[PDB]
Amino acid sequence: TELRDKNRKVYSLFYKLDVVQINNGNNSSNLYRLINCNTSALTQACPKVTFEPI
Amino acid sequence: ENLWVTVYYGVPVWKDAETTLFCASDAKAYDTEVHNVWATHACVPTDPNPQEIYMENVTEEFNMWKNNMVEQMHTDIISLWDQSLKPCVQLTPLCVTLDCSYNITNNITNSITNSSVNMREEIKNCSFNMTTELRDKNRKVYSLFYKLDVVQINNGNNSSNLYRLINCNTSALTQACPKVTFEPIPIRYCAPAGYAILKCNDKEFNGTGLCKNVSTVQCTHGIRPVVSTQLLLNGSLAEGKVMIRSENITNNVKNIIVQLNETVTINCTRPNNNTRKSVRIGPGQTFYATGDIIGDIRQAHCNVSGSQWNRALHQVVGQLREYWNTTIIFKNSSGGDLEITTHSFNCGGEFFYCNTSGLFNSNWTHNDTASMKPNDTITLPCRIKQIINMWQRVGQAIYAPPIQGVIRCESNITGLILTRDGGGNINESQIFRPGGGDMRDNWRSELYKYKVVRIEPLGVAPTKAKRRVVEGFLGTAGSTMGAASITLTVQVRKLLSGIVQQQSNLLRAIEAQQHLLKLTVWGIKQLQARVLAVERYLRDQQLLGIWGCSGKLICTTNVPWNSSWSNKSEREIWENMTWLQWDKEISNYTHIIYELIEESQKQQEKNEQELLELD
Amino acid sequence: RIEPLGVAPTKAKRRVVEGFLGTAGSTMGAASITLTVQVRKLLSGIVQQQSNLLRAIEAQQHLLKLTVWGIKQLQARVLAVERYLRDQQLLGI
Amino acid sequence: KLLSGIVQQQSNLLRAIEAQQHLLKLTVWGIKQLQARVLAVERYLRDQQLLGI
């Protein structure tokens, strides 16, 4: 949360390609890591800045 | 008869400038041998004698509100503030939920004064978890904190020793580098070569309009841009008369800029001492919390000498008779931002907000003496805040560290930025109340005299002289054309005094003890201004060399001046134009004259002569 | 690149003591009078510079935001000025 | 050889990077070197201005 120790279980939606299962997930709803997190870091794309050409 | 064009340089010319200023300060600021108390960067120390040359029998316009000085000033101030913010350790792990206790083992909780602040003592002692230097090791430790720093978490029933920082949930927070303080220094802003400052010494001259008593200057008077809302501290007084200005007197929304004639003391004091506790949180990151205070915790109060304030208000309301004889109303700020709701400032780094309590308790409408008789030693409450969003920059906040020792605060008064109420009658009566929203108002209040001015040494004139065909900074010109020919050596020498500015830089990396990189828009744009001034002089010398005029300032012309100009005598041109009205008359044809002197003078040059020679 | 320096042998000898770039497609005598068309704009970097207006910001507010672009532009200005400075020094020599 | 610092500058080749790859990598060294270039040029420029005077 905005507080330091406070944690909240919130829900969202992720793409199918942006994550991959882990922990030898033969058949179950096992956890999922990010495809690029263990390789390198990640940060927000600054949504106010658009990526259109001029 | 023959109107041979003639070019001149180093001629006194004054125009509207838009360039970069350069920070500076007196020698005392740099001899303090501290890394930086709040201006003392590696800025160029002031020249031993910045020339302020008078100039009479001249005229120049002024629009103080349209000046670009305060823009760059607050930009560089915010940049230096960020630079000083960089080395500070962060306070992000401090945002955990805490438990505090209001009533503590101290004697006084209710002082003699009660202004809805005794119950709001803003003094609690609070425990908080902090990580040890090692990763997993943590520990709970206690300190003292105010009520304004946090707010009770309303998610539960009540506070119940549960609080959250007001600024943490909005943005991050870092300390204010306590080795750096927040005290004022006289700041002098110098101009580059080809640019200067123009000061108007006329007292009755208001913030805008025309002025004649000109003074050309290299660096402004040392300004103290003290952070002050609804009041100006340690600013220049309007000698001889109280100055009242505004953007639009008909519009009530515009601020009522004021500059007073005298000053009065303000004893705002926290008598009870302060303490410090440097608790190490991380690998070399330590928070200097406000430890346990010794002695009775007296409520930080303030006092004002209303006797001299009565005389100041008498002189003001004598000055407030703009378009009336007896009608005025004074009111308080009914609400808004905390900077506008109360007179806000800082005193040594702690954000002291000493109240505007007794400001609205006055009405000098019918009998001025009725307000002079009640000599009231105005005791009032004054609060303190640890955090602030400077210039609405809601980012990495700044925490004010302990100020250890009994806290006294004295501050002059030189100007009250009032505002007129729009929700009132127009001519029945006028209401004024304090407003401290825009900080740039207080800064331009002292710059109504100073205005940046450009030097355009180029000059043209028709005379009867012609060459052979082939086949005192800026003064002593109020009305002259012949005197400019005498001063062609001094003005040209002063036109390129930028090397004297660059000589005294002392910017190797650091000046006083130690610094970070700290190289930002200020220094690089100063170097850019140097480069652009040198480029201007280079293009000037290039145009001289193209015309063959690089050997001397006086340079004739082969083409005679056309007859499109309106008829005028040469003596009248020399007596009553001061070199400026003539340039006003040839504004559009100047490019044609440039083209003529550049093309015909060069292409029509024959090669040699052979008939007769010493051989 | 533009190298305005040009040389040619002719009969002209000094006394002894004792339209950006056009208007010459194929010319040597007529090109010997159109020199100023190139020289006037050769040292006219201020023309391109005057339209910057980079006081601090443009729209409301920005951070420091001065990077390889601006400093490389300043360096290009400096070196282009140094080239013509060395040229004019050689001319004076 | 007085104002001939361009000979020293021509070999720099600081386009962005030299050896394999780099970050921005422009600090007190390069900017103060450029400042020294500008000041050394400005000194003799003012000298030549005094000559022309």
Ligand SMILES: *[C@@H]1O[C@H](CO)[C@@H](O[C@@H]2O[C@H](CO)[C@@H](O[C@@H]3O[C@H](CO[C@H]4O[C@H](CO)[C@@H](O)[C@H](O)[C@@H]4O)[C@@H](O)[C@H](O[C@H]4O[C@H](CO)[C@@H](O)[C@H](O)[C@@H]4O)[C@@H]3O)[C@H](O)[C@H]2NC(C)=O)[C@H](O)[C@H]1NC(C)=O
């Ligand atoms: C970090 O946390 C702080 C504290 O929670 C936020 O600061 C403000 O918090 C208040 C309370 O949540 C916000 O709401 C304000 O409520 C005022 C009345 O409070 C009662 O009603 C609210 C529900 O509206 C209850 O939740 C509350 O318990 C009280 O019972 C209103 O008066 C405010 O709006 C009016 O007054 C203001 C001030 O006069 C006017 O400017 C408004 O135009 C309006 O007339 C307000 O609704 C308040 O919004 C929070 N501030 C801001 C700026 O949003 C911080 O916001 C939070 N950080 C972030 C990033 O959100």
Ligand SMILES: *[C@@H]1O[C@H](CO)[C@@H](O[C@@H]2O[C@H](CO)[C@@H](O[C@@H]3O[C@H](CO)[C@@H](O)[C@H](O)[C@@H]3O)[C@H](O)[C@H]2NC(C)=O)[C@H](O)[C@H]1NC(C)=O
């Ligand atoms: C700064 O000082 C001013 C002036 O005192 C404060 O504004 C208002 O002052 C009046 C004084 O009469 C307060 O009204 C009084 O309140 C008491 C206590 O509730 C009551 O017993 C009286 O009958 C009278 O109504 C008024 O409350 C006060 N305004 C507010 C918003 O409290 C101002 O509060 C002071 N500000 C600070 C930060 O100290």
Ligand SMILES: *[C@@H]1O[C@H](CO)[C@@H](O[C@@H]2O[C@H](CO)[C@@H](O[C@@H]3O[C@H](CO)[C@@H](O)[C@H](O)[C@@H]3O)[C@H](O)[C@H]2NC(C)=O)[C@H](O)[C@H]1NC(C)=O
């Ligand atoms: C306007 O200018 C005056 C004079 O310059 C400022 O007076 C300053 O007042 C403070 C206390 O109110 C003094 O603080 C003391 O500083 C010494 C420095 O060694 C320190 O040892 C003490 O413990 C104490 O903190 C300060 O010296 C004094 N003079 C200064 C700063 O020159 C006044 O503060 C200015 N107005 C405003 C609004 O800042």
Ligand SMILES: *[C@@H]1O[C@H](CO[C@@H]2O[C@@H](C)[C@@H](O)[C@@H](O)[C@@H]2O)[C@@H](O[C@@H]2O[C@H](CO)[C@@H](O)[C@H](O)[C@H]2NC(C)=O)[C@H](O)[C@H]1NC(C)=O
């Ligand atoms: C926070 O997570 C804990 C642990 O759950 C695991 O970690 C999560 C990030 C997610 O990956 C889950 O699928 C994992 O199972 C949640 O579980 C409780 O945590 C509390 C606090 O430590 C503990 O007292 C309970 O016993 C835990 N209960 C269970 C069933 O694991 C926790 O609920 C999450 N936070 C919130 C606000 O729901």
Ligand SMILES: *[C@@H]1O[C@H](CO)[C@@H](O[C@@H]2O[C@H](CO)[C@@H](O)[C@H](O)[C@H]2NC(C)=O)[C@H](O)[C@H]1NC(C)=O
């Ligand atoms: C400004 O002055 C007015 C008085 O004209 C104050 O008004 C009082 O405000 C309190 C709020 O605490 C109310 O309880 C009173 O009923 C109000 N009285 C009147 C006559 O309006 C106002 O609080 C003052 N505001 C500030 C910021 O000082």
Ligand SMILES: *[C@@H]1O[C@H](CO)[C@@H](O[C@@H]2O[C@H](CO)[C@@H](O)[C@H](O)[C@H]2NC(C)=O)[C@H](O)[C@H]1NC(C)=O
């Ligand atoms: C000098 O001024 C005169 C008059 O201002 C110019 O005369 C112009 O002559 C042309 C014919 O070549 C006419 O078409 C114009 O109408 C004339 N001007 C006016 C205002 O009537 C003359 O051209 C100017 N010469 C130079 C070199 O500028």
Ligand SMILES: *[C@@H]1O[C@H](CO)[C@@H](O[C@@H]2O[C@H](CO)[C@@H](O)[C@H](O)[C@H]2NC(C)=O)[C@H](O)[C@H]1NC(C)=O
């Ligand atoms: C130079 O040309 C400009 C171009 O218009 C002239 O500007 C006009 O001047 C007249 C009076 O001289 C004003 O009534 C107009 O309002 C001006 N134009 C604008 C758009 O404001 C200027 O006067 C010319 N100056 C000279 C000396 O000839």
Ligand SMILES: *[C@@H]1O[C@H](CO)[C@@H](O)[C@H](O)[C@H]1NC(C)=O
């Ligand atoms: C990181 O995760 C991805 C996805 O499984 C894969 O490259 C691999 O498992 C990890 N990388 C390495 C170097 O092990």
Ligand SMILES: *[C@@H]1O[C@H](CO)[C@@H](O)[C@H](O)[C@H]1NC(C)=O
């Ligand atoms: C507070 O101080 C007074 C003297 O000023 C003393 O008589 C009294 O006992 C003190 N009370 C406490 C709780 O310390």
Ligand SMILES: *[C@@H]1O[C@H](CO)[C@@H](O)[C@H](O)[C@H]1NC(C)=O
């Ligand atoms: C304390 O409160 C009373 C009534 O609430 C008020 O009359 C008195 O003026 C207050 N004290 C001060 C110093 O204003």
Ligand SMILES: *[C@@H]1O[C@H](CO)[C@@H](O)[C@H](O)[C@H]1NC(C)=O
């Ligand atoms: C406040 O307390 C009451 C009684 O304990 C409870 O019913 C109510 O839910 C509490 N309010 C909250 C949790 O917001």
Ligand SMILES: *[C@@H]1O[C@H](CO)[C@@H](O)[C@H](O)[C@H]1NC(C)=O
């Ligand atoms: C004009 O400026 C000069 C500056 O030397 C000053 O001596 C003089 O008193 C000023 N006059 C007025 C009327 O302000």
Ligand SMILES: *[C@@H]1O[C@H](CO)[C@@H](O)[C@H](O)[C@H]1NC(C)=O
């Ligand atoms: C300032 O004075 C001039 C006259 O010198 C006047 O025209 C102008 O309106 C005044 N400024 C304001 C804001 O009224």
Ligand SMILES: *[C@@H]1O[C@H](CO)[C@@H](O)[C@H](O)[C@H]1NC(C)=O
């Ligand atoms: C405050 O005003 C007095 C005159 O009343 C003056 O001597 C003093 O220098 C002023 N304080 C400053 C400028 O800090």
Ligand SMILES: *[C@@H]1O[C@H](CO)[C@@H](O)[C@H](O)[C@H]1NC(C)=O
């Ligand atoms: C106070 O102001 C009045 C008018 O504003 C002025 O006449 C007087 O000289 C001032 N007092 C001084 C300068 O001591």
Ligand SMILES: *[C@@H]1O[C@H](CO)[C@@H](O)[C@H](O)[C@H]1NC(C)=O
């Ligand atoms: C001042 O404001 C009034 C209306 O409030 C408007 O009529 C007038 O034109 C304005 N004057 C100036 C100089 O802005």
